[PDB]
Design an enzyme around this catalytic site. Structure first.
Site, short mmCIF file in Angstrom:
data_model
loop_
_atom_site.label_atom_id
_atom_site.label_comp_id
_atom_site.label_asym_id
_atom_site.label_seq_id
_atom_site.Cartn_x
_atom_site.Cartn_y
_atom_site.Cartn_z
N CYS A 102 1.70 3.24 3.52
CA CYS A 102 2.15 2.39 4.62
C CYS A 102 3.65 2.50 4.87
CB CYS A 102 1.70 0.94 4.33
SG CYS A 102 2.84 -0.42 4.72
N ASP A 108 0.87 -1.16 0.00
CA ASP A 108 0.00 0.00 0.00
C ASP A 108 0.92 1.22 0.00
OD1 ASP A 108 -1.68 2.22 0.92
OD2 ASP A 108 -3.18 0.65 1.34
N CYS A 113 5.78 -0.55 4.15
CA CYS A 113 5.80 -0.92 2.75
C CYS A 113 6.84 0.03 2.19
CB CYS A 113 4.45 -0.64 2.09
SG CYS A 113 3.05 -1.42 2.93
N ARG A 138 -5.74 -0.93 1.45
CA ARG A 138 -6.41 -1.26 2.70
C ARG A 138 -7.73 -0.54 2.97
NH1 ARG A 138 -1.16 -0.30 6.35
NH2 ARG A 138 -1.45 1.67 5.22
#
Lengths: 209, 209
Positions: B97, B94, B100, B124
Site C-alpha cells: 500500500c 499493508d 502505508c 487486505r
C-alpha cells in the site's frame, strides 16, 4: 421517567416516550428513532434490540410493546367477528391483491373456525395513488364493512380521501416487518405474514401458544 | 458470572466471556457473536449496541472493551518508539500500500513529533496469497523492525509462513471497522483510519482528548 428525555433531546431523539423495560435500572424508551432502552439515570442508551429466548426462541421484548400499539387501533380495524371466537387475528390487507381477495372470500370459513378477522390497511404501492386514496375512503366510511365488502366485489368508491389512517396502518405494518399482503398478525404479537387458508391458519395459531 | 453461559450455550453462542458492563444487573458479554449484554440473572440478552453520549457524542462502551483487546497484542506489534512519546498510535498496515509506505518513510517525523508508531498487520487481499504469507514472515521474524524496514525497501522475504498472527490482527481490524490502509487507531480507542501526515496526525490526536 422525569430525568431522562432531556439528554435524549440533546441527542436528536424525537417523540420520546418511556415505559416498562423487563430490566430494572432501564426503561423501554419507545422513541421516534425506535424502541430504545435507557437507564433510570440517563447516561446510557441501547440503540440495539433486547430479547429473551424463554423457550420458543429469541422473543423480542418490544414485540409486546408493538402489539399494544396495533391493538390500540381496534376502532379503525374493519372487523368480521365469528359466532364465538377462539382466535382474533389482525390482517394487513391491500385491495389490489389476489390473495387478500381470496382470504376475504373465506371470512365465513375463518369465522366458522372461531377466528375473528380484523383488517388494517396496507397500501403497498405507497400512499400516492388512486388505490391508496380509495382505501382511505373505505377505512373511514360510514360502515367500513360495506365499503370494503363492495371494494372486494369490484365496486371501488368514486370519490376519495387523502391517505392518513391508512398511512398510520402502513407505518405500523413496516414496524412489524410486513413485506407483502396478506399478512396475519397473531393475537400474541406474532406474525405468520402471508396467505394461509382457514384450516392452516387455525393450526398455526393453535400450535404456537 | 457463573449462572449465565449456560442459557447462552443453549442459544448457539460461542466463546462466551463475561465482563464489566457500565450497567449493573448486566455484564458485557464479549461473545463470538459479538459484544453482547446480559442480565446477572441470565434471562435477557441485548444483541444490540450500548452507548453513552457523554459530551463528544455516541461513544460505544465496547470501544474500550475493544482497545484492551488490541493493546493486549503489544508484543506482536512492530514498534518504532519516539525520543520520548506524547502519543502512542497503532496503525493497521499493508506492505503493498502506497500510503502505508509513505507513512513509513516518515517514522522519523512522527517519532520527532512525540508519536510512537505501532504496527499491526492488515492484509487486505485476504490471507490467501504470497503477500499475506510474507507479512506473517515479517511479523514473526527474529527482529520484525529489520524485516519490515526491508520489506518496505522492496526486499520481501524469500521463504514464507502461513497466515496466523496476521490473521488475528486482521480480524481485530475489522472489529474496529478498518476498511483500508493505513488506518491509525488512537490510544483512546478512537480511529482516524486513513493516511495522515505527521503534523496532521498530531493535531487530530491533541484536539480529541
Amino acid at each position: 421517567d422525569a430525568a431522562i428525555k432531556r439528554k435524549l433531546q440533546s441527542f436528536n431523539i424525537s417523540n420520546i416516550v418511556i415505559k416498562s423495560s423487563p430490566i430494572s435500572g432501564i426503561k423501554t424508551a419507545v422513541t421516534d428513532q425506535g424502541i430504545l432502552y435507557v437507564s433510570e439515570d440517563g447516561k446510557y442508551l441501547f440503540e440495539g434490540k433486547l430479547y429473551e429466548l424463554t423457550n420458543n426462541g429469541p422473543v423480542d421484548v418490544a414485540g409486546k410493546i408493538l402489539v399494544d400499539k396495533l391493538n390500540s387501533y381496534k376502532d379503525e380495524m374493519i372487523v368480521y367477528p365469528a359466532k364465538n371466537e377462539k382466535h382474533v387475528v389482525t390482517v394487513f390487507m391491500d385491495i389490489t391483491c389476489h390473495y387478500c381477495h381470496l382470504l376475504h372470500q373465506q371470512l365465513k370459513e375463518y369465522n366458522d373456525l372461531g377466528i375473528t378477522v380484523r383488517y388494517l390497511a396496507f397500501p403497498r404501492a405507497g400512499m400516492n395513488n388512486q388505490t391508496a386514496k380509495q382505501m382511505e375512503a373505505i377505512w373511514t366510511a360510514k360502515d367500513p364493512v360495506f365499503a370494503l365488502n363492495e371494494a372486494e366485489k369490484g365496486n371501488l368508491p368514486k370519490e376519495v380521501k387523502t391517505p392518513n389512517i391508512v398511512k398510520k396502518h402502513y407505518e405500523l405494518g413496516i414496524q412489524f416487518g410486513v413485506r407483502g399482503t396478506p399478512s396475519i398478525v397473531t393475537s400474541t404479537g406474532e406474525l405468520i405474514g402471508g396467505y394461509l387458508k382457514p384450516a392452516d391458519l387455525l393450526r398455526a395459531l393453535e400450535e404456537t401458544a
